[PDB]
Design an enzyme around this catalytic site. Structure first.
Site, mmCIF file in Angstrom:
data_model
loop_
_atom_site.group_PDB
_atom_site.id
_atom_site.type_symbol
_atom_site.label_atom_id
_atom_site.label_comp_id
_atom_site.label_asym_id
_atom_site.label_seq_id
_atom_site.Cartn_x
_atom_site.Cartn_y
_atom_site.Cartn_z
ATOM 1 N N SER A 1 -2.696 2.048 5.550
ATOM 2 C CA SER A 1 -2.172 1.594 4.266
ATOM 3 C C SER A 1 -2.557 0.141 4.049
ATOM 4 O O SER A 1 -2.533 -0.656 4.987
ATOM 5 C CB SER A 1 -0.650 1.708 4.227
ATOM 6 O OG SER A 1 -0.221 3.010 4.592
ATOM 7 N N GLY B 1 0.811 -1.220 0.000
ATOM 8 C CA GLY B 1 0.000 0.000 0.000
ATOM 9 C C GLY B 1 0.840 1.263 0.000
ATOM 10 O O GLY B 1 2.066 1.199 0.094
ATOM 11 N N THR B 2 0.175 2.414 -0.086
ATOM 12 C CA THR B 2 0.869 3.705 -0.103
ATOM 13 C C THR B 2 1.406 4.016 1.290
ATOM 14 O O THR B 2 1.032 3.366 2.265
ATOM 15 C CB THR B 2 -0.035 4.874 -0.562
ATOM 16 O OG1 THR B 2 -0.892 5.289 0.511
ATOM 17 C CG2 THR B 2 -0.878 4.491 -1.782
ATOM 18 N N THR B 3 2.279 5.011 1.387
ATOM 19 C CA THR B 3 2.885 5.341 2.671
ATOM 20 C C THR B 3 1.956 6.243 3.471
ATOM 21 O O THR B 3 1.372 7.186 2.934
ATOM 22 C CB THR B 3 4.261 6.014 2.512
ATOM 23 O OG1 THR B 3 5.148 5.128 1.817
ATOM 24 C CG2 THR B 3 4.861 6.355 3.878
#
Lengths: 241, 244, 111, 235, 250, 240, 231, 195, 243
Positions: free
Chosen positions: I74, I29-31
């Site tokens: 995330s 996932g994104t940070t």
């Protein structure tokens, strides 16, 4: 073999899921130990905070279950907290129904029964934890009662749990073999704590700063945990010795 | 989810048989033999116990033969504890009938409801079938003396003489040879024990390895008596026909 | 003891011509010997050229109208936007009313 | 094994796709829509000649303005017919009117995906639903166990279906008369049927606004069979 | 969530064995030896208290359990399974008997109820059989003294004397030699102590040996006086001290 | 509740549990029904590998559902009791609400619906049973004979058989049953029925049961002899 | 592979294969486009028939006076999800006298889809949806996927060869975003967008489906002769 | 409803049951048959609350007819009467109890004896030589106490009934429009058509 | 083996492999991060710009619980929402019975037990998110991070997702360089910086920054989104430092 995935018997009479839950017990790589004073029951466990970003004050494997009972857990924290929440609920319900404080041994039997159920009923997994319950019971005196994923439990003179558990155990047997008694013959809990830290240092062959330990004490009518500074004060006394 | 561990106890083989029923029958075929024989003046039930140790309490015992009401008894081959579940059900069923109609339950009707229970475990619920076959001995005022058997499929049939458990093949062949319709209770007693004597897997048949019962008109006038033989009475009946 | 009903007064009337119909009602709303409002309408356009009023206990009247308007909305959703004929509305309203046969809506309804 | 509601890697429901295979094994059924009516016809396919063929019931009334034919595991269709009849009669109770053919079809199709681990498997039968209503006139619908339904000018389902559908593609136009459509249904049934079509092993029906839904007696159908032979010989 | 395990986990194999019952019996074979002997005026049940650590306090783990004032139980196999069976056994003695008839159930009947509980774990959805065999000793007015064995399948048998667990084959043979129908309770206790010494390899005193009797009524153990018809429990657990007394004259 | 979908579709579009239920039927003793001009007959094989049987009390293979309708079957015996009971209950319930006994077709549809239901419900297997259901509608004299199977399909038959070797006896009936001319009498119909079973049975000993159903709730089972008279009678007309 | 037997199983790289297979049914679906200005939002969809004798399957569904959607994939699942939305819009009106914000409708669909991706026995929804609406904060377009992911966009497309229209809309963005106060122009731009996704087929009169909602326009669907105007 | 009687003589049970159905100030019917055949040798008459009576009678009839088909056998009068009592005893603690009183007259073929059971709505059962429900009994019980003999014939029984009906037509306040009379003996159940 | 095919099964090493697989989904996932400050907490997350067609500002990812708690996560976004919905129910039920708004540690355990519960049975799947959350109660500021296993601790700073190592390293720096405290305003800017730095390990697509905070002095103990000038100011500060 699907007798490996759920809590049914293997051809040799074994419950593998229970056995593997015992292995999960050591995941955290912490050891704990408990001993009885004349007046008190002391429990100590190693404290390891490897990540600099953690708030060290929130890292604990010791729980205040009731005003009189403490519990230290060996095993992963999510399972540990599940067990703690249940024990708190059980201890408070017991007080409301029966009009007196749940004894340590009775709570242990109760939590042991719940664990037994997960070994027999398939849809529930065992919890990967060992639970050490401590108090100064109003009938039985200083008490240590310990639960495992098999639903086994028994009371102890003293006990140890974790990867290096056999070393601490023999160290403690050796002390009592020598003193010829069931407990630490000591007045103050401060000195019983000091005994506990000392015989852990010896058995584990390591030295401790104030942030490498975590300590809980049970007296008549309260169980409490020590602060870093309380532990320091106690480490200092062990040094000047 | 849990699908992974489901045996599917209530399905058909590609040959259209019910696996679990067949395997329960296999289980039963290793249990102590039980024999029922029907005479014109009464009924006999005999059963061989599973190999006794000398230390087993033989008199305060029961394992094979059970009273259902005062006019009906059963002999059991298979899992005992499974059988007790069904027996208490049957005892209760008899009493509801008596309560409802103020007449003792006709034998078939009780036999049918027990067999209907068994049948259910083969069609729905995904549980294992009961590992039991019964021989039913009883009397009612419509058909007189009757014998039935039922097995894990919930199938039942009526007999003049029949066996369940181990060695029913040999046992059935012997009964077929010496059974006759005009026969009396006391002859049938002899036949039951002769048949067990030849089919047994033990070295010799003794009183301590047996249970025995009769249902006769042998009280006073138009009424029926169940006699579950004490060990002593078996020891006698075994000499009185010289098997000892 | 709690009485779940009240009476809000007012009165209504409908007349049908050859190629039109009217539904009339006063706009007074009362309880006991007081006036709650001199202008509270109780005759409504419900869509598909159907006007409705349910007059008596106004809380019941409003619930019924609301339920019927909503009925028209789902009639459209369920039968490809078909127009709800007045005879069909009438039958629908019978089922709305009779569904509360043992705890009735206290209203005289006219459409 | 694996769950009854599983997707294949190609994004299709295994159980639905497999029920479609069972439908392909069914007897043939054909319907054609005209501005004078809709005709429905079926292959009876008696498994043995001792079986009394008029007891084979694969065309069915839903309401006076709606009829139905079926193909596949036909025992599965009893409860679909029951639901359809109830939906139609219930609609008339609530609204003092006839229920639209499309709405009826949508209601039957709502049952379709009510299976899983609610019934234990999809239906193993397709339906042709034909009727009339004042809003959209004469209509034919194909109701599948996927829950999908299409409107058709004409359609075949069952074992003979890819054959018959190619044929219907050629023969159908927007001016067919009821009589023209009846003959067509017979013609194409005779093409795809195993045994030789007669008035005992195939059956016809229509729905007209005026007389509603009617199943034809064997006498009436026999003459239409005769009349089809005479047309065919004659060029 | 919820139990999707509504199907049996014990089923018949092609040979007709019920695997999970066999395997439970195997767990019972691995278990520590226990035994019971029936005398003319008593029953004795006994087992070894094999400790977990020597830091453990083995008094706090009681293998021999009072069920009613005239009935006691001991086991071999899985101790936690036994513990919950004792809880249920005590409760069912009340709910299905004492609360109905105003008196405690006779031994065969209480045994019957335990056997039922164990049979259900052999057929109900989503559970495994209990991994224990029980020996239950008791007294009741119309049957006198009796001794039963209950097995994982739910089957139970009345015995004159028997043993279960590790050394059961040898101990059953030792008991066949020494049992007669005139044993008086003190003699049956002495035989039990003898039989257990065979199967215990370690220390053998009243702290590693757990033993109880079903004998005379103990009015001193009642807790009250004033009702003539209430005469005290027939169940007594021998103390550590009382066992060592008998071990000297052994 | 145990939930598992046991009856499901295979890749080829078969429901294997329903098809395996038919195998259970294939293994059952043969049963056959023949309808006459004015009657219907039901005959049933009984496997004679069983002497010592008590036939007074052993369940008969034909069952009265109401006083004017009967049902026979091939397949699992224990399954058939379940269908028989439900049908009897429905028979009484129909009389109670409609004030008329069931038509045979109605009773058949009911039994068939029960069988279909067990092929698309979770936690149950299909019935290992096919039935022959025969009788006369109230105040009607046209005879009726219907067949159901595990899938739930049902249909009407001039004559029909089910069970082991039913393929052999269907063969027989197929060339011996004149559609145009049904057995104009009781006696004739009982004969054709016994003939068709002797193709498959062995000795006409305790190996054949017959039940005859005439209009207005007139139902009788024959005994050994009366059947046996046909056994002997047909066998002599045989040497040719 | 071993991990695609149901939704409740993660693969060793953290994927949910049953959800991915649901996404795949969308990809076979006929293409549909959405886009919007500051005053209107438009849906354009290419419909699809079984053969020359059948109707064209409907792809656009009205949810309330101010909201509706188009579908690509399993149509019965769209009927379930659109119906759930009709109810949610309805509950908002009856209880609060409030038209449901298009953003909230998005969240409700996300949470509904999610529940089917975490329990045994269920299956994910096998349909993708484009929701348009006009509410108290103007015109909106949303993209629903049965993974549970919902996204607010100026324009988009889903279905087979939807990539064509998607790039086109990415190019056109600064133009169509400002087609304010002119319905027939926004539609034309949407019809153009969808044409970048055609092959061996072109837009006909019983082939094409359009819907619009906006500032003074209830959600309305155009079909048959009413789309000739734009072909 | 109102009048139902029963007499048991040497070889039969006779039931007599009034024909009127009255609601408000209107006699709606004068030919009502307040009886159901439970089996070929068991008859049941009934009186009590409108609707409840027929519903209950028909519900029992269905159950006995079911038992008959299932066992190919006919329950004894005693057995049927116990089944009926239990049903009424359940009803009495229901949310809405059946308010129905019955007489059951049967000929028991196993014993060759006629039997009469009187059961009220509470499930109170007694076997009796003669029985009556409602206000009827206040006249007929004493009359029968005097004129009844245990060995009477079916014809003597019918005259005894004529006496009962005559008294009720003299002293009762309501016009019950005569009775339908039914005999239950070894040969089944028949209706006397001229009374 | 096959110990990894079903949730809640122990492997022979004592692990639950399905939870470990949930973690791979989180790692993908994104940070997102959290920073604890003097009198509050700051939350920030990298939102990838998949396409120009995404409406900027209009796909909000940080979520409020009650009036004083922020949550960011995330991994599988829908799972994150599910967890927050539960959090909202737990907070409502606490405030209903006890009147006071839910304390942060109390709230953390509510999420913990619920997430842990999804590792107990084979009929559910574990959560595919790690969740960073916190706020201000009567005892000060608290920051927490919660894993798919249900494990959680209190944090000085926290990070999860694709850029977790880079963000962690940056977070350690601040904790060393500011041992007496960080103001809520230092933190908002530092949060901007770290998200920009962590975007390295995910630099294909460019991204939108989203920030929120609770601070006793700055937001009055309530959770608020950072927008307008304060947001632009924090972006500017961040752009300064990657250059």
């Amino acid at each position: 073999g699907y007798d490996r995935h759920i809590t049914i018997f293997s051809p040799e009479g074994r419950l593998y899921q229970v056995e593997y839950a015992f292995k999960a017990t050591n995941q955290t790589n912490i050891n704990s130990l408990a001993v009885r004073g004349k007046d008190c029951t002391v429990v100590i466990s190693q404290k390891k905070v490897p990540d600099k970003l953690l708030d060290p004050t929130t890292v604990s494997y010791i729980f205040c279950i009731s005003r009189t009972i403490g519990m230290v857990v060996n095993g992963p924290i999510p399972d540990a907290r599940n067990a703690a929440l249940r024990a708190k609920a059980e201890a408070a319900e017991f007080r409301y129904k029966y009009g007196y404080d749940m004894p340590c041994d009775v709570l242990a039997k109760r939590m042991a029964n719940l664990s037994q159920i997960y070994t027999q009923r398939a849809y529930m997994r065992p919890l990967g934890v060992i639970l050490t319950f401590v108090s100064v019971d109003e009938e039985l005196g200083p008490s240590i009662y310990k639960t495992d994923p098999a639903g086994y439990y028994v009371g102890y003179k003293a006990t140890a749990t974790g990867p290096k558990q056999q070393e601490i155990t023999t160290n403690l047997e050796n002390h009592f073999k020598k003193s010829k008694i069931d407990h630490i013959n000591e007045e103050s809990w401060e000195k019983v704590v000091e005994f506990a830290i000392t015989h852990m240092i010896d058995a584990l062959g390591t030295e401790f700063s104030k942030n490498d330990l975590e300590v809980g004490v049970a007296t008549k009518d309260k169980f409490f945990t020590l602060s870093a500074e309380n532990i320091e004060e106690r480490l200092v006394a062990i040094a000047e010795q | 989810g849990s699908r992974r561990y489901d045996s599917r106890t209530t399905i058909f083989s590609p040959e259209g048989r019910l696996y679990q029923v067949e395997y329960a029958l296999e289980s039963i075929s290793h249990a102590g033999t039980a024999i029922g024989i029907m005479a014109s003046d009464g009924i006999v039930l005999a059963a061989e116990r599973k190999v006794t140790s000398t230390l087993l309490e033989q008199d305060t015992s029961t394992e094979k033969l059970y009273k259902l009401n005062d006019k009906i008894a059963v002999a059991v081959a298979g899992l005992t504890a499974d059988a007790e579940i069904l027996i208490n059900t049957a005892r209760i069923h008899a009493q509801n009938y008596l309560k409802t109609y103020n007449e003792d339950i006709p034998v078939e009707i009780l036999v049918r409801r027990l067999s209907d229970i068994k049948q259910g475990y083969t069609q729905h619920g995904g549980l294992r079938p009961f590992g039991v076959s019964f021989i039913y001995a009883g009397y009612d005022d419509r058909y007189g003396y009757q014998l039935y058997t039922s097995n894990p499929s919930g199938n039942y049939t009526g007999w003049k003489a029949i066996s369940v458990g181990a060695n029913t093949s040999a046992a059935q062949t012997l009964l077929q040879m010496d059974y006759k319709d005009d026969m009396k209770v006391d002859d049938a007693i002899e036949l039951a024990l002769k048949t067990l004597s030849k089919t047994t897997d033990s070295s010799a048949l003794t009183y301590d390895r047996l249970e025995f019962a009769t249902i006769r008109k042998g009280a006073n006038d138009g009424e029926v008596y169940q006699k579950i033989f004490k060990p002593q009475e078996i020891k006698d009946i075994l000499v009185k026909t010289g098997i000892t | 003891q709690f009485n779940p009903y009240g009476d809000n007064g007012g009165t209504i009337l409908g007349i049908a011509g050859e190629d039109f119909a009217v539904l009339a009602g006063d706009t007074r709303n009362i309880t006991d010997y007081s006036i709650n409002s001199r202008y509270e309408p109780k005759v409504f356009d419900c869509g598909d050229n159907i006007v409705m009023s349910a007059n008596g206990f106004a809380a019941d009247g409003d619930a019924l109208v609301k339920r019927f308007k909503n009925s028209v909305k789902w009639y459209h959703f369920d039968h490809n936007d078909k127009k709800l004929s007045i005879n069909s509305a009438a039958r629908n309203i019978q089922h709305l009313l009779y569904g509360k046969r043992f705890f009735p809506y206290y209203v005289h309804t006219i459409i | 094994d694996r769950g009854v509601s599983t997707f294949s890697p190609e994004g299709r429901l295994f159980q639905v796709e497999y029920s479609l295979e069972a439908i392909k094994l069914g007897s043939t059924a054909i319907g054609i829509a005209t501005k004078e009516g809709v005709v429905l016809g079926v292959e009876k396919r008696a498994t043995s000649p001792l079986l009394e063929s008029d007891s084979i019931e694969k065309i069915v009334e839903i309401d006076r303005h709606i009829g139905c034919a079926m193909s596949g595991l036909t025992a599965d269709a009893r409860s679909m017919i029951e639901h359809a009849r109830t939906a139609a009669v219930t609609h008339n109770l609530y609204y003092d009117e006839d229920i639209n053919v499309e709405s009826l079809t949508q209601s039957v199709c709502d049952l379709a995906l009510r299976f899983g681990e609610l019934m234990s498997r999809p239906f193993g039968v397709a339906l042709l639903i034909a009727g009339h209503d004042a809003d959209d006139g004469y209509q034919l619908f194909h109701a599948e166990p996927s829950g999908t339904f299409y409107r058709y000018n004409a359609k075949a389902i069952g074992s003979g279906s890819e054959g018959a559908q190619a044929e219907l593609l050629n023969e159908w136009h927007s001016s067919l008369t009821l009589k023209e459509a009846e003959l067509l249904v017979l013609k194409i049934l005779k093409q795809v049927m195993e045994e030789k079509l007669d008035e005992n092993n195939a059956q016809l029906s229509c729905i007209t606004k005026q007389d509603g839904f009617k199943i034809y007696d064997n006498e009436k159908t026999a003459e239409l069979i005769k009349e089809l032979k005479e047309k065919e010989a004659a060029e | 969530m919820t139990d999707r395990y509504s199907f049996s986990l014990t089923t018949f194999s092609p040979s007709g064995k019920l695997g999970q019952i066999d395997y439970a019996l195997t767990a019972v074979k691995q278990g520590v030896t226990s035994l019971g002997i029936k005398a003319t005026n008593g029953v004795v049940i006994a087992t070894e208290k094999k400790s977990s650590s020597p830091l453990a306090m083995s008094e706090t783990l009681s293998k021999v359990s009072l069920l009613t004032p005239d009935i006691g139980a001991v086991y071999s196999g899985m101790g936690p399974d036994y513990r919950v069976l004792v809880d249920k056994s005590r409760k069912v003695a009340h709910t299905s008997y004492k609360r109905i008839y105003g008196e405690y159930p006779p031994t065969k009947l209480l045994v019957s109820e335990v056997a039922k509980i164990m049979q259900e774990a052999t057929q109900s959805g989503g559970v495994r059989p209990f991994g224990v065999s029980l020996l239950i000793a008791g007294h009741d007015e119309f049957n006198g003294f009796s001794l039963y064995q209950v097995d994982p399948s739910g089957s139970y048998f009345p015995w004159k004397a028997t043993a279960i667990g590790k050394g059961s084959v040898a101990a059953k043979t030792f008991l066949e030699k020494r049992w007669n129908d005139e044993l008086e309770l003190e003699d049956a206790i002495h035989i039990a102590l003898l039989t257990l010494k065979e199967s215990v390899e370690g220390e053998f005193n009243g702290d590693t040996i757990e033993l109880a009797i079903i004998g005379d009524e103990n009015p001193d153990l009642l807790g009250y006086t004033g009702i003539p018809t209430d005469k005290g429990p027939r169940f007594r657990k021998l103390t550590s001290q009382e066992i060592n007394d008998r071990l000297e004259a052994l | 509740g145990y939930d598992r979908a046991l009856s499901i579709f295979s890749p080829d579009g078969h429901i294997f549990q329903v098809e395996y239920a038919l195998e259970a039927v294939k293994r059952g003793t043969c049963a056959v029904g023949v309808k006459g001009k004015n009657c219907v007959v039901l005959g049933c094989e009984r496997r004679s590998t069983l002497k010592l049987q008590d036939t007074r009390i052993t369940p008969s293979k034909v069952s009265k559902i109401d006083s004017h309708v009967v049902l026979s079957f091939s397949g699992l015996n224990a399954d058939s009791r379940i269908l028989i009971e439900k049908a009897r209950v429905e028979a009484q319930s129909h009389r109670l609400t409609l004030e008329d006994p069931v038509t045979v077709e109605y009773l058949t549809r009911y039994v068939a619906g029960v069988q279909q239901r067990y092929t698309q419900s979770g936690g149950v297997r299909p019935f290992g049973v096919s039935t022959l259901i025969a009788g006369f509608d109230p105040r009607d004299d046209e005879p009726k004979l219907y067949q159901t199977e595990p899938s739930g399909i049902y249909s009407s038959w001039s004559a029909q058989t089910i069970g082991r070797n039913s393929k052999t006896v269907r063969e027989f009936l197929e060339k011996n049953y004149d559609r145009k001319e049904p057995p104009a009498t009781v006696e004739e119909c009982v004969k054709l029925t016994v003939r068709s079973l002797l193709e498959v049975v062995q000795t006409g000993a305790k190996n054949i049961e017959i039940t005859v159903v005439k209009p207005d709730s007139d139902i009788v089972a024959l005994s050994s002899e009366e059947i046996n008279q046909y056994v002997t009678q047909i066998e002599q007309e045989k040497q040719e | 592979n071993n991990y695609d037997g149901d939704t409740v199983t993660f693969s060793p790289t953290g994927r949910l294969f049953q959800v991915e297979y649901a996404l795949e049914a969308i990809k076979q679906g006929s293409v549909t486009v959405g886009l919007r200005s500051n005053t209107h939002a438009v849906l354009v969809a290419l419909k699809r028939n079984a053969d020359e004798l059948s109707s064209y399957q409907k792809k656009i569904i009205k949810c309330d006076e101010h909201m509706g959607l188009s579908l690509a994939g399993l149509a019965p699942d769209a009927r379930v999800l659109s119906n759930y939305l009709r109810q949610q819009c309805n509950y908002s009106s009856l209880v609060f006298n409030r038209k449901l914000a298009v953003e909230r409708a998005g969240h409700l669909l996300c949470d509904k889809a999610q529940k089917n991706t975490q329990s045994y026995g269920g299956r994910p929804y096998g349909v993708g949806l484009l929701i348009i609406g006009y509410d108290k904060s103007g015109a909106h377009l949303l993209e629903f996927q049965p993974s549970g992911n919902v996204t607010e966009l100026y324009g988009t497309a889903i279905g087979a060869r939807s990539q064509g229209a998607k790039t086109y809309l990415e190019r056109t963005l600064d133009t169509f975003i400002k087609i304010d106060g002119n319905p027939d122009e926004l539609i034309k731009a949407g019809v153009e967008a969808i044409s970048q996704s055609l092959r061996d087929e072109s837009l006909t009169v019983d082939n094409l489906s359009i819907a619009i909602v906006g500032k003074d326009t209830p959600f309305t669907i155009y079909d048959g002769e009413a789309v000739a105007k734009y072909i | 409803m109102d009048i139902i009687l029963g007499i048991r003589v040497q070889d039969s049970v006779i039931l007599a049951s009034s024909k009127a159905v009255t609601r408000g100030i209107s006699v709606l019917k004068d030919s009502d048959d307040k009886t159901r055949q439970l089996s070929p040798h068991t008859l049941m008459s009934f009186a009590g609350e409108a609707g409840d009576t027929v519903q209950f009678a028909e519900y029992i009839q269905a159950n006995i007819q079911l038992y008959s088909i299932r066992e190919d056998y006919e329950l004894s009068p005693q057995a049927v009467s116990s089944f009926v009592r239990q049903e009424l005893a359940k009803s009495i603690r229901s949310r809405r109890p059946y308010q129905v009183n019955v007489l059951i007259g049967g000929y028991d073929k196993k014993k060759n004896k006629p039997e009469l059971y009187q059961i009220d709505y509470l499930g109170t059962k007694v076997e009796l030589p003669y029985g009556a429900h409602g206000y009827s009994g206040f006249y007929t019980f004493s009359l029968l106490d005097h004129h009844y003999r245990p060995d009477m014939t079916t014809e003597e029984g019918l005259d005894l009934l004529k006496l009962c009906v005559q008294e009720l037509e003299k002293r009762m306040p309501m016009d019950f429009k005569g009775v339908i009379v039914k005999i239950v003996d070894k040969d089944g159940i028949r209706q006397v058509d001229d009374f | 083996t096959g110990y990894d095919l079903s949730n809640s099964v122990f492997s022979p090493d004592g692990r639950n492999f399905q939870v470990e697989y949930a973690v791979k989904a989180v790692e993908n996932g994104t940070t997102s991060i959290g920073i604890k400050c003097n009198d509050g907490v700051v939350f920030a997350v990298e939102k990838l710009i998949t396409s120009k067609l995404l409406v900027p500002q209009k796909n909000v990812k940080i979520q409020v619980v009650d009036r004083h708690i922020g949550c960011v996560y995330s991994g599988l976004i829908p799972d994150g929402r599910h967890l927050v919905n539960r959090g909202r129910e737990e907070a409502a039920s606490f405030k209903k019975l006890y009147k006071t708004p839910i304390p942060i540690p109390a709230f953390a355990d509510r999420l913990g037990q619920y997430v842990q519960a999804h590792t107990l049975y084979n009929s559910v799947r574990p959560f595919g998110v790690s969740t960073i959350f916190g706020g201000v109660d009567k005892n000060g500021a608290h920051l927490y991070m919660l894993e798919p296993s249900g494990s959680y601790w209190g944090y000085k700073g926290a990070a999860t997702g694709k850029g977790r190592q880079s963000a962690k390293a940056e977070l350690e720096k601040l904790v060393d360089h500011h041992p007496e405290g960080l103001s809520a305003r230092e933190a908002v800017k530092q949060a901007a910086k770290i998200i920009y730095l962590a975007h390295e390990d995910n630099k294909e697509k460019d991204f939108e920054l989203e920030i929120s905070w609770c601070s006793l002095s700055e937001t009055n103990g309530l959770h608020k989104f950072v927008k307008g000038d304060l947001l632009q100011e924090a972006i500017d500060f961040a752009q300064k430092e990657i250059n």
